[PDB]
């Protein structure tokens, strides 16, 4: 195979509780080894590995560079977060909730598709009583197009008349979404 030499530079911001806690971590990476890091909590460049020691010492010796990096948490992260508040953080895409039976009838699949943001709570109910045993969920699935999906399976032995409800809570919903699957025969 051809040989490849990879360099990555990541200027990353971390936000918690709005902008109560804002943290900047700048990362210099050779192939997959992070070698130099600027963590705004630390306030100077730190060599993660020996490969990054000359750069860390060189940049740290430059007053003008250091002061620029120390102010970058407020200048970059806080400026861009205000842009996020008007755009990404306002994105609300309501989930599409769908029930379909399966077999391994003995399995209900609640498909919760195309929602944003990621925060979501999906519950199964059998005759208004929440089911906890026999519930198997996929991980949160990132579609890559600024939507998520997730599948929540319920192992079931249905009696005729049973109503199975998929209960979905999402920040885009003023009230939860409920979809029902009603057993027409006894399994």
């Amino acid at each position: 195979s051809p040989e490849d030499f990879v360099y990555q530079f990541k200027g990353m911001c971390y936000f918690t509780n709005g902008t109560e806690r804002v943290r900047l971590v700048s990362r210099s990476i050779y192939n997959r080894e992070e070698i130099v890091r600027f963590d705004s909590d630390v306030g100077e460049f730190r060599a993660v590995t020996l490969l990054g020691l000359p750069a860390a010492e060189y940049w740290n010796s430059q007053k003008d560079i250091l002061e620029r990096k120390r102010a970058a948490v407020d200048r970059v992260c806080r400026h861009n977060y205000q842009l996020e508040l008007r755009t990404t953080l306002q994105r609300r895409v309501e989930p599409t909730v769908t029930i379909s039976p399966s077999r391994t009838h003995n399995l209900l699949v609640c498909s919760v598709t195309d929602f944003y943001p990621a925060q979501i709570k999906v519950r199964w109910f059998r005759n208004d009583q929440e089911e906890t045993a026999g519930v198997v969920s996929t991980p949160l699935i990132r579609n890559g197009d600024w939507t998520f999906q997730i599948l929540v399976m319920l192992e079931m032995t249905p009696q005729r008349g049973d109503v199975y409800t998929c209960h979905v809570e999402h920040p885009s919903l003023q009230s939860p979404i409920t979809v029902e699957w009603r057993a027409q025969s006894t399994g």
Partner: T-cell receptor
Amino acid sequence: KEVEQDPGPFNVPEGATVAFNCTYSNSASQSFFWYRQDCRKEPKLLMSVYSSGNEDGRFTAQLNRASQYISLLIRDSKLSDSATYLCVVMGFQKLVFGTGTRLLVSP
Amino acid sequence: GVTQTPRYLIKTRGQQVTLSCSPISGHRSVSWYQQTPGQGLQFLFEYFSETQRNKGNFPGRFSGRQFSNSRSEMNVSTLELGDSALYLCASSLRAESGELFFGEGSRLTVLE
């Protein structure tokens, strides 16, 4: 093993020059300091250590990354210099205090 | 500079203790160290922005805390005879600094 200083106590006559030596194992170590600690009291930052040779009064600290040696020089030692001198080495997410070399200046 | 209380304390084995450290005004990082004869300075933990940033190898009965004014507390829930030591706190402006400003310590003697 990470930070190794001169072991035994230094018994030095007043007026003599004293040389403290310290070695560190991790080549990635970034910053180096000398601390001073009087008996049963707290450590106090004495000076930062540079390759060029930091000189502050009677004190000289120097770093040699090739041999991975740190040195502290005390010219014209005074009775008040009597203390334990700690070699302190900083690497990524680890700050290591040496066990210290005790100095006793006699009149 | 750095203010530690209590400065001296006698406890018995099995008792609990809480030590307090007020860092230099404006400093945000508080570290705790244990000073015993023959072992030197041992790192307990460092607190920054009210959360524990780094931790040493001490048992779980050693715990700490940092408040919103950067004052920090250190606690031992069940003291052993071997916990007798000078407990030192050090403050620095920023996290993970090699330039530390130490208080005068809390001298804790644990007796049977």
